[PDB]
């Protein structure tokens, strides 16, 4: 195991792994060339998703999901079931009768880029809208945002 987990064969569709026709100097070179599309709106494509060996179907930068419409943030809470995380999201609701606010919260699941270990919990993240990835997975993760207030360099 310890490298990949699959029954079928996972690959980027756009790339064609079997271009290999020439024997000449090298039968195999810098192999299975990488596919990645950058999202707009200025979000920086992580270097991990460029030189990475992983294969994903719904990764924002290396899949087919199309981010649009709504962009929000959150505070990560759980690192449970693989390829998606659960984020609390605190906010204030205003009661009209009193002139006073009332705290609420609504926590939702979001997909992830499988590039990432080193995504701790309790840290802010910026999340974007997507096509309905699953029953409760709509929003998708674009870039995580907290490492300085943490441990050793």
């Amino acid at each position: 195991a310890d490298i990949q987990t699959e029954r079928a064969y996972q690959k980027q569709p756009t790339i064609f792994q079997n271009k290999k026709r020439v024997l000449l100097g090298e039968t195999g070179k810098e192999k299975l060339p990488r596919y990645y599309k950058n999202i707009g709106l200025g979000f920086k494509t992580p270097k991990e998703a460029i030189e990475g060996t992983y294969i994903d179907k719904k990764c924002p930068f290396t899949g087919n999901v199309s981010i649009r419409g709504r962009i929000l943030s959150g505070v990560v809470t759980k690192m449970k079931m693989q390829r998606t995380i659960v984020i609390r999201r605190d906010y204030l609701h205003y009661i009209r009768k009193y002139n006073r606010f009332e705290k609420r919260h609504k926590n939702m699941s979001v997909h992830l880029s499988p590039c990432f270990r080193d995504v701790q919990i309790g840290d802010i993240v910026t999340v974007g809208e997507c096509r309905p990835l699953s029953k409760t997975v709509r929003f998708n993760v674009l870039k995580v945002t907290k490492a300085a207030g943490t441990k050793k360099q």
């Binding site: 064969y9 079997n18 026709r21 020439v22």
Partner: protein
């Protein structure tokens, strides 16, 4: 009677959704068109908004492609070997998208023996003498004899695919959805993903 509803199953919050309407036309399902191997029998379906569907029940020829030579041909399926979804869909000889079949290698070998003029099948030396010697050699005053020599080199097929051509069957995934369109079209298997798929067939039995 089946419906592709989202109002017949619980919320994420464990609660139960009491419906507020009875089943609706604009969201519907029909029994599976689980197509097997046999004489070409494709039976019709009408769907929402016109654009009538063609669903297949028994198929034998498909437009399988060879990705390493930019050529594709019609080809007579003869088997089914591996499906990553179900196991009971390889015994049944079903046909679905991404179902690894065995296609007839006759059109591709014939094409190879006519393109590069290098033999790709010899066990008894049965045939195949007259055409191949002719074509590589001079036929229009030394022009063609040059360009086939360019093709004598760099004619590639791996022993991962060489042995299949000798054996007459080519592992080939299906990439066209037989249930909805009706055509059993896909690509031949080669390279590393052939290697990965070869081992699974070798040691599927457990």
């Amino acid at each position: 009677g089946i419906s592709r509803d989202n109002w017949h199953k619980r919320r994420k919050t464990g609660g139960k959704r009491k419906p507020y309407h009875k089943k609706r036309k604009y969201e519907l399902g029909r029994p599976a068109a689980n197509t097997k191997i046999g004489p070409r029998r494709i039976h019709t379906v009408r769907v929402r908004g016109g654009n009538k569907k063609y669903r297949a029940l028994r198929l034998d020829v498909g437009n399988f492609s060879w990705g390493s030579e930019c050529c594709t041909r019609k080809t007579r399926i003869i088997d089914v070997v591996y499906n990553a979804s179900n196991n009971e869909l390889v015994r049944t000889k079903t046909l679905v998208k991404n179902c690894i079949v065995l296609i007839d290698s006759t059109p591709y070998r014939q094409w190879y023996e006519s393109h590069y003029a290098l033999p790709l099948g010899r066990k008894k030396g049965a045939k195949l003498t007259p055409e191949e010697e002719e074509i590589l050699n001079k036929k229009r005053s030394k022009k063609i004899q040059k360009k086939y020599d360019e093709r004598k080199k760099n004619a590639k097929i791996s022993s991962l695919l060489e042995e299949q051509f000798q054996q007459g069957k080519l592992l080939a995934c299906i990439a066209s959805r037989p249930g909805q369109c009706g055509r059993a079209d896909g690509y031949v298997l080669e390279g590393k993903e052939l290697e990965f798929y070869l081992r699974k067939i070798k040691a599927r039995k457990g």
